[PDB]
Amino acid sequence: SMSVKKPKRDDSKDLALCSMILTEMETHEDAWPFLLPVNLKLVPGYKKVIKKPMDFSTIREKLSSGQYPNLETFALDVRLVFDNCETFNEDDSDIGRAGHNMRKYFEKKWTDTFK
């Protein structure tokens, strides 16, 4: 509350560390469904169904231009990518499996870097 603060957690390396995680997600062999925005002209149903499209290249541009206020807003966009994937793709599909794989990969790096 006013003039009453918990001890200051050091967030000065968060930008660099999120960038490293994102580089590892970019280079994973199962990243290919997530590298670029879904083409809304060429994929029937995507525009109407997926209210907030997100992909790794859009997160990379947001990260590089100071559009994440803190490390939690960064994780929310990464998780959005996977939530969108599960909304649109069957689990028993190459893309559906890729999304599960990458979500696991992310959540481990997240825990190990920050928790």
Short mmCIF file of N, CA, C and O in Angstrom, two decimals:
data_model
loop_
_atom_site.label_atom_id
_atom_site.label_comp_id
_atom_site.label_asym_id
_atom_site.label_seq_id
_atom_site.Cartn_x
_atom_site.Cartn_y
_atom_site.Cartn_z
N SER A 1 0.92 -1.22 0.00
CA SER A 1 0.00 0.00 0.00
C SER A 1 0.90 1.19 0.00
O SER A 1 2.16 1.05 -0.17
N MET A 2 0.33 2.41 0.15
CA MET A 2 1.18 3.65 0.24
C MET A 2 2.35 3.58 1.20
O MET A 2 2.21 3.48 2.45
N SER A 3 3.58 3.74 0.62
CA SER A 3 4.82 3.75 1.43
C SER A 3 5.13 2.33 2.09
O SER A 3 5.91 2.24 3.06
N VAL A 4 4.52 1.32 1.55
CA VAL A 4 4.68 -0.11 2.05
C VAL A 4 4.85 -1.01 0.87
O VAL A 4 3.88 -1.39 0.15
N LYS A 5 6.12 -1.38 0.62
CA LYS A 5 6.47 -2.23 -0.53
C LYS A 5 7.22 -3.47 -0.20
O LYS A 5 8.15 -3.33 0.61
N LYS A 6 6.83 -4.61 -0.78
CA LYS A 6 7.64 -5.84 -0.81
C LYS A 6 8.99 -5.53 -1.41
O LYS A 6 9.11 -4.61 -2.25
N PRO A 7 10.01 -6.30 -1.04
CA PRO A 7 11.36 -6.16 -1.59
C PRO A 7 11.40 -6.19 -3.16
O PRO A 7 10.62 -6.96 -3.76
N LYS A 8 12.24 -5.31 -3.75
CA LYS A 8 12.29 -5.13 -5.23
C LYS A 8 13.00 -6.34 -5.95
O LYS A 8 14.22 -6.38 -5.95
N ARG A 9 12.22 -7.32 -6.43
CA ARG A 9 12.67 -8.28 -7.51
C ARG A 9 13.39 -7.63 -8.74
O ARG A 9 12.94 -6.61 -9.29
N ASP A 10 14.59 -8.13 -9.08
CA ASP A 10 15.45 -7.47 -10.08
C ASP A 10 14.88 -7.89 -11.47
O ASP A 10 14.92 -9.08 -11.81
N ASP A 11 14.27 -6.92 -12.14
CA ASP A 11 13.70 -7.12 -13.51
C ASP A 11 14.59 -6.55 -14.65
O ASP A 11 14.13 -6.47 -15.82
N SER A 12 15.82 -6.11 -14.33
CA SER A 12 16.68 -5.40 -15.30
C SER A 12 17.19 -6.26 -16.50
O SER A 12 17.58 -5.72 -17.56
N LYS A 13 17.21 -7.55 -16.29
CA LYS A 13 17.55 -8.53 -17.32
C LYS A 13 16.35 -9.22 -18.05
O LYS A 13 16.55 -10.08 -18.94
N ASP A 14 15.16 -8.80 -17.68
CA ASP A 14 13.96 -9.51 -18.22
C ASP A 14 13.91 -9.40 -19.76
O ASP A 14 13.52 -10.41 -20.42
N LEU A 15 14.13 -8.20 -20.29
CA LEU A 15 14.08 -7.98 -21.77
C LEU A 15 15.02 -8.91 -22.52
O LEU A 15 14.63 -9.61 -23.48
N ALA A 16 16.28 -9.00 -22.08
CA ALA A 16 17.24 -9.85 -22.65
C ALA A 16 16.91 -11.31 -22.52
O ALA A 16 17.14 -12.14 -23.43
N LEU A 17 16.43 -11.71 -21.34
CA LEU A 17 16.09 -13.07 -21.14
C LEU A 17 14.81 -13.51 -21.98
O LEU A 17 14.79 -14.65 -22.49
N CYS A 18 13.79 -12.64 -22.01
CA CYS A 18 12.59 -12.95 -22.93
C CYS A 18 13.07 -13.13 -24.41
O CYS A 18 12.60 -14.03 -25.14
N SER A 19 14.03 -12.27 -24.82
CA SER A 19 14.58 -12.31 -26.19
C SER A 19 15.25 -13.66 -26.44
O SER A 19 15.11 -14.26 -27.49
N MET A 20 16.00 -14.18 -25.47
CA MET A 20 16.63 -15.46 -25.55
C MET A 20 15.66 -16.61 -25.65
O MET A 20 15.85 -17.48 -26.44
N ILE A 21 14.65 -16.63 -24.80
CA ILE A 21 13.58 -17.59 -24.90
C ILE A 21 12.94 -17.58 -26.31
O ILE A 21 12.73 -18.66 -26.90
N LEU A 22 12.63 -16.41 -26.79
CA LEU A 22 11.92 -16.25 -28.08
C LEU A 22 12.82 -16.78 -29.19
O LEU A 22 12.34 -17.50 -30.05
N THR A 23 14.16 -16.51 -29.08
CA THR A 23 15.12 -17.06 -30.08
C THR A 23 15.09 -18.59 -30.09
O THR A 23 15.03 -19.24 -31.19
N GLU A 24 14.99 -19.25 -28.92
CA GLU A 24 14.95 -20.65 -28.81
C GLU A 24 13.62 -21.22 -29.41
O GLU A 24 13.61 -22.24 -30.04
N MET A 25 12.52 -20.48 -29.20
CA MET A 25 11.22 -20.86 -29.77
C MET A 25 11.29 -20.71 -31.32
O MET A 25 10.89 -21.66 -32.02
N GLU A 26 11.86 -19.61 -31.82
CA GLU A 26 12.06 -19.39 -33.26
C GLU A 26 12.85 -20.51 -34.00
O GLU A 26 12.55 -20.82 -35.15
N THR A 27 13.81 -21.10 -33.34
CA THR A 27 14.72 -22.06 -33.94
C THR A 27 14.30 -23.49 -33.71
O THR A 27 14.93 -24.42 -34.27
N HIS A 28 13.27 -23.78 -32.93
CA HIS A 28 12.74 -25.12 -32.72
C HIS A 28 12.20 -25.65 -34.06
O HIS A 28 11.53 -24.92 -34.84
N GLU A 29 12.46 -26.92 -34.32
CA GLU A 29 12.03 -27.48 -35.60
C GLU A 29 10.48 -27.49 -35.81
O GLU A 29 10.02 -27.51 -36.96
N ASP A 30 9.68 -27.39 -34.75
CA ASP A 30 8.25 -27.41 -34.81
C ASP A 30 7.65 -25.96 -34.75
O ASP A 30 6.44 -25.86 -34.56
N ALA A 31 8.46 -24.98 -34.95
CA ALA A 31 8.03 -23.59 -34.90
C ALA A 31 7.28 -23.17 -36.18
O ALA A 31 6.66 -22.11 -36.16
N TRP A 32 7.49 -23.91 -37.30
CA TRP A 32 7.01 -23.46 -38.62
C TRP A 32 5.55 -22.98 -38.69
O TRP A 32 5.32 -22.06 -39.48
N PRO A 33 4.58 -23.53 -37.90
CA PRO A 33 3.19 -22.98 -37.98
C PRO A 33 2.97 -21.59 -37.38
O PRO A 33 1.90 -21.01 -37.62
N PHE A 34 4.01 -21.14 -36.62
CA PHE A 34 3.95 -19.99 -35.67
C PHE A 34 4.88 -18.87 -36.08
O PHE A 34 4.86 -17.84 -35.39
N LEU A 35 5.70 -19.02 -37.10
CA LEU A 35 6.77 -18.02 -37.42
C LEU A 35 6.22 -16.71 -37.94
O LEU A 35 6.78 -15.65 -37.63
N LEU A 36 5.11 -16.80 -38.66
CA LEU A 36 4.54 -15.66 -39.37
C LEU A 36 3.07 -15.60 -39.10
O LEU A 36 2.38 -16.59 -38.76
N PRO A 37 2.45 -14.42 -39.27
CA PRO A 37 1.01 -14.37 -39.05
C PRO A 37 0.24 -15.28 -40.06
O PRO A 37 0.72 -15.49 -41.22
N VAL A 38 -0.82 -15.85 -39.57
CA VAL A 38 -1.73 -16.66 -40.42
C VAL A 38 -2.28 -15.72 -41.51
O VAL A 38 -2.63 -14.59 -41.15
N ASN A 39 -2.32 -16.20 -42.79
CA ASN A 39 -2.76 -15.28 -43.90
C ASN A 39 -4.31 -15.24 -43.91
O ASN A 39 -4.94 -16.25 -44.20
N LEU A 40 -4.87 -14.14 -43.46
CA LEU A 40 -6.31 -14.02 -43.26
C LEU A 40 -7.08 -13.96 -44.55
O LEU A 40 -8.31 -14.19 -44.53
N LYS A 41 -6.41 -13.64 -45.65
CA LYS A 41 -7.05 -13.75 -46.99
C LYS A 41 -7.13 -15.18 -47.46
O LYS A 41 -8.07 -15.51 -48.19
N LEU A 42 -6.18 -16.03 -47.09
CA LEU A 42 -6.07 -17.37 -47.65
C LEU A 42 -6.51 -18.50 -46.78
O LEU A 42 -6.50 -19.64 -47.24
N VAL A 43 -6.91 -18.21 -45.53
CA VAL A 43 -7.33 -19.28 -44.58
C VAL A 43 -8.73 -18.98 -44.14
O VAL A 43 -9.01 -18.17 -43.22
N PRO A 44 -9.69 -19.61 -44.89
CA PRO A 44 -11.10 -19.48 -44.48
C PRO A 44 -11.34 -19.73 -42.99
O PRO A 44 -10.83 -20.69 -42.41
N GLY A 45 -12.16 -18.89 -42.41
CA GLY A 45 -12.64 -18.98 -41.06
C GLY A 45 -11.75 -18.31 -40.00
O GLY A 45 -12.23 -17.94 -38.93
N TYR A 46 -10.47 -18.10 -40.35
CA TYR A 46 -9.51 -17.59 -39.30
C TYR A 46 -9.81 -16.26 -38.73
O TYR A 46 -9.80 -16.06 -37.47
N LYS A 47 -10.13 -15.32 -39.65
CA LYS A 47 -10.43 -13.95 -39.28
C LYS A 47 -11.61 -13.84 -38.33
O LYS A 47 -11.54 -13.16 -37.30
N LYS A 48 -12.70 -14.54 -38.68
CA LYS A 48 -13.90 -14.50 -37.81
C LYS A 48 -13.78 -15.24 -36.47
O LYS A 48 -14.29 -14.86 -35.44
N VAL A 49 -13.10 -16.37 -36.47
CA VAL A 49 -13.02 -17.19 -35.32
C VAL A 49 -11.95 -16.73 -34.31
O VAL A 49 -12.21 -16.78 -33.11
N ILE A 50 -10.80 -16.32 -34.81
CA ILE A 50 -9.62 -16.04 -33.90
C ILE A 50 -9.56 -14.54 -33.65
O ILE A 50 -9.13 -13.78 -34.49
N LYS A 51 -10.04 -14.15 -32.50
CA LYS A 51 -10.30 -12.73 -32.32
C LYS A 51 -8.99 -11.91 -32.16
O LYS A 51 -8.94 -10.72 -32.50
N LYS A 52 -7.94 -12.57 -31.64
CA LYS A 52 -6.67 -11.93 -31.43
C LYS A 52 -5.52 -12.82 -31.98
O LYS A 52 -4.91 -13.58 -31.19
N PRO A 53 -5.24 -12.72 -33.29
CA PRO A 53 -4.15 -13.51 -33.97
C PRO A 53 -2.83 -13.12 -33.31
O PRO A 53 -2.63 -11.94 -32.92
N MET A 54 -1.93 -14.08 -33.17
CA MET A 54 -0.60 -13.77 -32.61
C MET A 54 0.38 -14.77 -33.21
O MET A 54 -0.02 -15.95 -33.51
N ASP A 55 1.64 -14.38 -33.41
CA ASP A 55 2.65 -15.28 -33.99
C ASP A 55 4.02 -14.81 -33.46
O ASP A 55 4.12 -13.69 -32.99
N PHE A 56 5.07 -15.61 -33.71
CA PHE A 56 6.42 -15.28 -33.16
C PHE A 56 6.98 -14.02 -33.76
O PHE A 56 7.64 -13.25 -33.01
N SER A 57 6.76 -13.77 -35.06
CA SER A 57 7.33 -12.55 -35.65
C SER A 57 6.70 -11.25 -35.11
O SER A 57 7.43 -10.23 -34.93
N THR A 58 5.42 -11.28 -34.75
CA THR A 58 4.67 -10.18 -34.17
C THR A 58 5.17 -9.99 -32.72
O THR A 58 5.47 -8.83 -32.29
N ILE A 59 5.40 -11.08 -32.00
CA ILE A 59 5.95 -10.94 -30.62
C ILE A 59 7.34 -10.35 -30.69
O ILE A 59 7.72 -9.46 -29.88
N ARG A 60 8.15 -10.81 -31.68
CA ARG A 60 9.53 -10.28 -31.84
C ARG A 60 9.51 -8.79 -32.12
O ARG A 60 10.29 -7.99 -31.48
N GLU A 61 8.62 -8.33 -32.98
CA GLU A 61 8.53 -6.89 -33.25
C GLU A 61 8.03 -6.08 -32.00
O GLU A 61 8.53 -4.97 -31.69
N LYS A 62 7.07 -6.62 -31.26
CA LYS A 62 6.57 -5.98 -30.05
C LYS A 62 7.73 -5.91 -28.99
O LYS A 62 7.85 -4.85 -28.27
N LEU A 63 8.47 -6.99 -28.83
CA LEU A 63 9.56 -7.06 -27.87
C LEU A 63 10.65 -6.01 -28.20
O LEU A 63 11.08 -5.25 -27.35
N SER A 64 11.03 -5.99 -29.46
CA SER A 64 12.09 -5.09 -29.94
C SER A 64 11.68 -3.61 -29.90
O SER A 64 12.60 -2.73 -30.07
N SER A 65 10.44 -3.25 -29.76
CA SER A 65 9.97 -1.85 -29.86
C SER A 65 9.34 -1.38 -28.57
O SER A 65 8.54 -0.43 -28.53
N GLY A 66 9.68 -2.09 -27.45
CA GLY A 66 9.13 -1.67 -26.12
C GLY A 66 7.69 -1.67 -25.90
O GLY A 66 7.10 -0.91 -25.14
N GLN A 67 6.97 -2.63 -26.58
CA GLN A 67 5.56 -2.77 -26.40
C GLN A 67 5.08 -3.82 -25.35
O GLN A 67 3.86 -3.95 -25.12
N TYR A 68 6.05 -4.50 -24.74
CA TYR A 68 5.74 -5.28 -23.52
C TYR A 68 6.11 -4.46 -22.23
O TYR A 68 7.32 -4.33 -21.95
N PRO A 69 5.08 -4.13 -21.44
CA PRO A 69 5.39 -3.44 -20.16
C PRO A 69 6.12 -4.28 -19.16
O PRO A 69 6.92 -3.75 -18.37
N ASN A 70 5.90 -5.60 -19.14
CA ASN A 70 6.58 -6.42 -18.18
C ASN A 70 6.66 -7.88 -18.75
O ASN A 70 6.08 -8.18 -19.83
N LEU A 71 7.38 -8.74 -18.04
CA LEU A 71 7.60 -10.13 -18.55
C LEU A 71 6.24 -10.90 -18.62
O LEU A 71 6.06 -11.79 -19.47
N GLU A 72 5.24 -10.58 -17.78
CA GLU A 72 3.98 -11.29 -17.83
C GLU A 72 3.17 -11.00 -19.12
O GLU A 72 2.50 -11.88 -19.68
N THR A 73 3.25 -9.76 -19.64
CA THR A 73 2.52 -9.48 -20.85
C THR A 73 3.18 -10.21 -22.02
O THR A 73 2.51 -10.53 -22.97
N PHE A 74 4.47 -10.45 -21.96
CA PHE A 74 5.19 -11.25 -22.95
C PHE A 74 4.70 -12.70 -22.93
O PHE A 74 4.32 -13.22 -23.98
N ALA A 75 4.60 -13.26 -21.72
CA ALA A 75 4.13 -14.69 -21.62
C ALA A 75 2.68 -14.82 -22.12
O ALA A 75 2.31 -15.84 -22.70
N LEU A 76 1.86 -13.81 -21.88
CA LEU A 76 0.46 -13.86 -22.29
C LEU A 76 0.37 -13.98 -23.85
O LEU A 76 -0.44 -14.71 -24.40
N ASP A 77 1.17 -13.19 -24.54
CA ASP A 77 1.21 -13.31 -26.03
C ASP A 77 1.76 -14.64 -26.50
O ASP A 77 1.27 -15.12 -27.51
N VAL A 78 2.80 -15.20 -25.84
CA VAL A 78 3.33 -16.48 -26.28
C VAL A 78 2.16 -17.53 -26.11
O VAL A 78 1.87 -18.35 -26.98
N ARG A 79 1.50 -17.49 -24.95
CA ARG A 79 0.44 -18.49 -24.65
C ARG A 79 -0.73 -18.29 -25.63
O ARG A 79 -1.35 -19.28 -26.06
N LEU A 80 -1.04 -17.06 -26.00
CA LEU A 80 -2.04 -16.76 -27.03
C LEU A 80 -1.80 -17.49 -28.32
O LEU A 80 -2.74 -18.00 -28.94
N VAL A 81 -0.56 -17.59 -28.77
CA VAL A 81 -0.18 -18.29 -29.96
C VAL A 81 -0.71 -19.75 -29.84
O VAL A 81 -1.31 -20.28 -30.76
N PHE A 82 -0.42 -20.36 -28.72
CA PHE A 82 -0.82 -21.76 -28.53
C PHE A 82 -2.28 -22.02 -28.30
O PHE A 82 -2.85 -23.05 -28.77
N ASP A 83 -2.93 -21.09 -27.63
CA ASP A 83 -4.36 -21.10 -27.46
C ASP A 83 -5.11 -20.93 -28.71
O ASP A 83 -6.07 -21.68 -29.03
N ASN A 84 -4.64 -20.03 -29.56
CA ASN A 84 -5.21 -19.90 -30.93
C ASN A 84 -5.05 -21.15 -31.74
O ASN A 84 -6.00 -21.58 -32.42
N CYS A 85 -3.90 -21.77 -31.62
CA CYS A 85 -3.57 -23.00 -32.39
C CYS A 85 -4.59 -24.08 -31.95
O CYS A 85 -5.13 -24.82 -32.80
N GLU A 86 -4.81 -24.20 -30.65
CA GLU A 86 -5.72 -25.28 -30.16
C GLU A 86 -7.16 -24.98 -30.56
O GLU A 86 -7.96 -25.90 -30.82
N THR A 87 -7.52 -23.70 -30.60
CA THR A 87 -8.87 -23.31 -31.05
C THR A 87 -9.20 -23.75 -32.51
O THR A 87 -10.35 -24.18 -32.83
N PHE A 88 -8.23 -23.69 -33.39
CA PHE A 88 -8.39 -23.88 -34.82
C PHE A 88 -7.94 -25.22 -35.39
O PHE A 88 -8.35 -25.56 -36.54
N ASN A 89 -7.14 -25.98 -34.66
CA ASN A 89 -6.51 -27.16 -35.20
C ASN A 89 -6.83 -28.38 -34.31
O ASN A 89 -6.89 -28.29 -33.05
N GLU A 90 -7.18 -29.47 -35.00
CA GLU A 90 -7.38 -30.73 -34.28
C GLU A 90 -6.06 -31.13 -33.58
O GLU A 90 -4.95 -31.06 -34.15
N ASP A 91 -6.18 -31.72 -32.38
CA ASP A 91 -5.01 -32.30 -31.68
C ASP A 91 -4.23 -33.33 -32.53
O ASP A 91 -3.02 -33.35 -32.54
N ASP A 92 -4.95 -34.21 -33.26
CA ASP A 92 -4.34 -35.22 -34.10
C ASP A 92 -4.12 -34.63 -35.52
O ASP A 92 -4.83 -34.98 -36.52
N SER A 93 -3.25 -33.64 -35.59
CA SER A 93 -2.83 -33.00 -36.85
C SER A 93 -1.39 -32.59 -36.63
O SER A 93 -0.97 -32.45 -35.47
N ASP A 94 -0.65 -32.36 -37.69
CA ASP A 94 0.74 -31.95 -37.57
C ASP A 94 0.79 -30.60 -36.81
O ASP A 94 1.62 -30.47 -35.90
N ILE A 95 -0.06 -29.65 -37.20
CA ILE A 95 -0.03 -28.32 -36.56
C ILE A 95 -0.48 -28.43 -35.10
O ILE A 95 0.13 -27.75 -34.19
N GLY A 96 -1.52 -29.26 -34.81
CA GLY A 96 -2.11 -29.38 -33.47
C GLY A 96 -0.97 -29.92 -32.55
O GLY A 96 -0.79 -29.47 -31.41
N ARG A 97 -0.26 -30.95 -33.00
CA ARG A 97 0.85 -31.56 -32.24
C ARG A 97 1.98 -30.57 -32.03
O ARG A 97 2.59 -30.49 -30.95
N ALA A 98 2.28 -29.80 -33.09
CA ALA A 98 3.33 -28.79 -33.02
C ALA A 98 2.97 -27.85 -31.90
O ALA A 98 3.88 -27.42 -31.17
N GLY A 99 1.74 -27.41 -31.84
CA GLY A 99 1.37 -26.42 -30.78
C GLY A 99 1.51 -26.94 -29.36
O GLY A 99 2.02 -26.30 -28.45
N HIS A 100 1.08 -28.18 -29.17
CA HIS A 100 1.32 -28.78 -27.84
C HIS A 100 2.76 -28.89 -27.50
O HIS A 100 3.10 -28.61 -26.32
N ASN A 101 3.61 -29.36 -28.43
CA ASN A 101 5.04 -29.51 -28.26
C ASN A 101 5.66 -28.15 -27.86
O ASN A 101 6.45 -27.99 -26.88
N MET A 102 5.32 -27.10 -28.65
CA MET A 102 5.94 -25.79 -28.38
C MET A 102 5.48 -25.17 -27.07
O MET A 102 6.28 -24.44 -26.42
N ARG A 103 4.25 -25.36 -26.71
CA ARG A 103 3.75 -24.88 -25.40
C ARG A 103 4.53 -25.50 -24.24
O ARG A 103 5.02 -24.78 -23.36
N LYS A 104 4.70 -26.83 -24.31
CA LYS A 104 5.62 -27.48 -23.32
C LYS A 104 7.02 -26.98 -23.26
O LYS A 104 7.56 -26.71 -22.16
N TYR A 105 7.67 -26.82 -24.42
CA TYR A 105 8.96 -26.31 -24.54
C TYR A 105 9.02 -24.93 -23.87
O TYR A 105 9.99 -24.62 -23.17
N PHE A 106 8.07 -24.06 -24.24
CA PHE A 106 8.01 -22.70 -23.63
C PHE A 106 7.88 -22.68 -22.09
O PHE A 106 8.73 -22.00 -21.44
N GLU A 107 6.97 -23.48 -21.56
CA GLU A 107 6.59 -23.43 -20.14
C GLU A 107 7.78 -23.90 -19.32
O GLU A 107 8.07 -23.30 -18.22
N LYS A 108 8.57 -24.84 -19.85
CA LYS A 108 9.80 -25.25 -19.14
C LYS A 108 10.86 -24.20 -19.12
O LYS A 108 11.45 -23.94 -18.05
N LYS A 109 11.12 -23.53 -20.26
CA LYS A 109 12.08 -22.49 -20.30
C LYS A 109 11.63 -21.34 -19.38
O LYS A 109 12.50 -20.63 -18.83
N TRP A 110 10.32 -21.08 -19.33
CA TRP A 110 9.79 -20.00 -18.54
C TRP A 110 10.06 -20.24 -17.02
O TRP A 110 10.57 -19.37 -16.35
N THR A 111 9.67 -21.41 -16.55
CA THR A 111 9.92 -21.86 -15.16
C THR A 111 11.39 -21.85 -14.81
O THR A 111 11.77 -21.32 -13.75
N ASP A 112 12.24 -22.41 -15.68
CA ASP A 112 13.66 -22.47 -15.40
C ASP A 112 14.36 -21.13 -15.42
O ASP A 112 15.39 -20.97 -14.74
N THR A 113 13.89 -20.17 -16.23
CA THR A 113 14.54 -18.86 -16.29
C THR A 113 14.10 -17.91 -15.15
O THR A 113 14.89 -17.04 -14.77
N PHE A 114 12.85 -18.00 -14.71
CA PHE A 114 12.21 -17.00 -13.86
C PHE A 114 11.63 -17.52 -12.51
O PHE A 114 11.45 -16.72 -11.61
N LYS A 115 11.37 -18.82 -12.35
CA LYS A 115 10.74 -19.39 -11.13
C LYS A 115 11.72 -20.27 -10.31
O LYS A 115 12.93 -20.01 -10.28
#
